[PDB]
């Protein structure tokens, strides 16, 4: 007689299995008759959440094997899905009463920042330039309303003020 053993591996490049997944490795099956079919023991659960994301059991490499004069070994793969991420968006406003932003200023609104981790610090993207001259006068960027904000379970939003000086 022979045994059937198990091992787990990550199927997600750059991610090692956490101990909570390794803790689910099945026990060896013992006393298997030579020439019988061995089938791997399924893990007692197929999902493990961590602070980084969720691991989900995919399958073993073989769903059975014939015992042929040696112990059998089954390799089970788990895959990782990162925890939900958030965005940081931007908006521009005029800080000059009675003056609306021209399109040339609005055209400088930064792109959204994506794939920000929960609990991370977001800092707004600075405009590509900070002055725009028009026939009427010049627009200058002042600042965003905050220098940074912690992502705490929601998208962030930064408001940038431009001021106008007439020609
Ligand atoms: Cl993890």
Author numbering: 623 to 789
Paper quotes:
Here, we show that repeat number variation in predicted bacterial surface proteins is more widespread and we characterize a third rod-like repetitive region in the Streptococcus gordonii protein (Sgo_0707) formed by tandem array of Streptococcal High Identity Repeats in Tandem (SHIRT) domains. The structure of single and tandem SHIRT domains from the streptococcal surface protein Sgo_0707 were determined. We call SasG, Rib, and Sgo_0707 “Periscope Proteins” due to their having variable-length stalk-like regions that define the distance that the N-terminal functional domain projects from the bacterial surface. Taken together, these data are consistent with multiple tandemly arrayed SHIRT domains from Sgo_0707 behaving as an elongated, rod-like particle.
The structure reveals two complete domains with a very short (Pro-Ala-Pro) linker; the structure of Sgo_R3-4 is ordered throughout (residues 623 through 789). Each domain adopts the SHIRT fold, and the interdomain interface is limited; this was confirmed by comparing the Tm of Sgo_R3 (75.7 °C) and Sgo_R3-4 (76.6 °C). The similarity of unfolding curves for single and double SHIRT constructs suggests that the two domains in the tandem construct unfold independently. Notably, there is a significant twist between domains when viewed along the long axis of the molecule. Small angle X-ray scattering (SAXS) analysis substantiates the anisotropic head-to-tail domain arrangement in solution. Molecular dynamics (MD) simulations of the Sgo_R3-4 construct show that individual domains are particularly stable (rmsd <1.5 Å for Cα atoms) over the length of the trajectory (0.8 μs); their individual length is conserved during the simulation and the length of Sgo_R3-4 fluctuates only moderately around 97 Å. Consistent with the models, the Dmax that was determined using SAXS scales with the number of domains; Sgo_R3-4 exhibits a Dmax of 107 Å and Sgo_R2-8 has a Dmax of 371 Å. Like Rib, there is no evidence for significant interdomain interfaces in tandem arrays of SHIRT domains.
